[PDB]
Amino acid sequence: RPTFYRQELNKTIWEVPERYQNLSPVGGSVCAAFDTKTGLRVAVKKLSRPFQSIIHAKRTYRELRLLKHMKHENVIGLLDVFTPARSLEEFNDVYLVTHLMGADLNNIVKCQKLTDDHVQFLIYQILRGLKYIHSADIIHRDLKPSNLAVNEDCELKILDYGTRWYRAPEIMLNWMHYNQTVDIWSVGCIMAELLTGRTLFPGTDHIDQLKLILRLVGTPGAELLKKISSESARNYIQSLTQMPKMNFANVFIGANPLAVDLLEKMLVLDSDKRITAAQALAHAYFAQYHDPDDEPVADPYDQSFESRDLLIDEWKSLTYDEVISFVPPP
């Protein structure tokens, strides 16, 4: 058991092993720290008030379980988790240590005009990671430029798994449960923006957002209208005149036609037909990066705990168990 020291930053006290030095406020709260053990810079996150409620405590537990499970070059992972508490009874603080990422994809599309090769590399990395996330049975559900860390070498990690601008339309319809392809929709929106320097669907609210989407992909085939239980949703789609399905070729003139085709296959209104991460990784557009022997899948992931109402002390105790059972990587 390590040596802890204490420190006031911004407004909050931090008690962390001595192994971590020069804590510097970045973003729970996030300090950047020097891992004296590895020489590497890392991020130390102090969860806010981890066991403030049933909702907070289950989330804390969920966040710990997720991060413990994620072992892939393109998905945020856990370097360490600790707590100053020395018993279950003391336990009120949780810290997570991860690679210091320092820039997001927003800081990348916003202050540049990326080339085609750059978009192949970034998107390929999203999809490689997403394949691993999906093969665990996890849907991420909030993929957007700000949940993607991109280091100075253009290496990418997916952050925060399990803005309306990237949300699959079926989510905006509420829709009684949906599938992994809700993520492929997001990816298609991210790609479009990488290529164009423009937000694809900068909807003003959830209604507008549907309009903007329809402008591009066209009003649903009767075979898709057939699947919408909601009459008011039905009505609104059939209202606002039947819209002209655009040619992606014109919306994306100048883009590599391979990029354009792939977009067409991602931004399909019917999540059934939307291309999957596994598939998209084999699309020609990625021919320079693809390698089926280096696109691993995840060990299956236990999320049965999502289907239960437990007490705070129960979520707390399970979280305590996970901290203590953490085994670090190489």
Ligand X SMILES: CCCCCCCCO[C@@H]1O[C@H](CO)[C@@H](O)[C@H](O)[C@H]1O
Strand partners, 9: 12
Q: For ligand X, which stretch binds (CB under 6 A), given 124-132, 174-182, 250-258, 299-307?
A: 174-182
Amino acid occupying residue 48: S
- To the question of whether residue 45 is assigned a binding role by annotation, the answer is yes
- To the question of whether residue 113 is assigned a binding role by annotation, the answer is no
The CA angle 178-200-170, to the nearest 5 degrees, is 15
Beta carbon nearer to ligand X, 30 or 173: 173
- To the question of whether residue 265 is assigned a binding role by annotation, the answer is no
Residue with tokens 């008011």: 232
**How many residues of this chain bind ligand X (CB under 6 A)?**
16
Cβ at position 183, least distance to ligand X in Å: 12
Does 169 help bind ligand X (rule: CB under 6 A)?
A: yes
Q: Say how many CA atoms lie within 13 Å of 64 toward its Cβ.
A: 30
Known catalytic residue: 321? no
What residues numbered 293-322 form the site for ligand X, per CB under 6 A? none
Cβ at position 182, least distance to ligand X in Å: 8
Does 170 help bind ligand X (rule: CB under 6 A)?
A: yes
The Cα-based distances of 76 to 96, 149, 275, 281, 304 in angstroms read 12, 9, 24, 20, 22
Does 214 help bind ligand X (rule: CB under 6 A)?
A: yes
Binding mask 218-257 for ligand X (x = CB under 6 A): --x---x--x---------x--------------------
**Which among 35, 80, 153, 160 is annotated as catalytic?**
160
Given a contact cutoff of 8 angstroms between Cβ atoms, the answer to whether 23 and 16 are in contact is yes
Strand partners, 82: 95
Q: For ligand X, which stretch binds (CB under 6 A), given 4-12, 58-66, 155-163, 206-214?
A: 206-214
Residue with tokens 């049965």: 304
DSSP state, residue 205: S
d(CA 16, CA 20): 7
Beta carbon nearer to ligand X, 114 or 224: 224
Given a contact cutoff of 8 angstroms between Cβ atoms, the answer to whether 266 and 184 are in contact is yes
Catalytically active residues, by annotation: 160
Binding residues: 26-30, 45
Residues forming the site for ligand X (CB under 6 A)? 169-170, 175, 178-179, 210, 213-214, 220, 224, 227, 237, 269-272
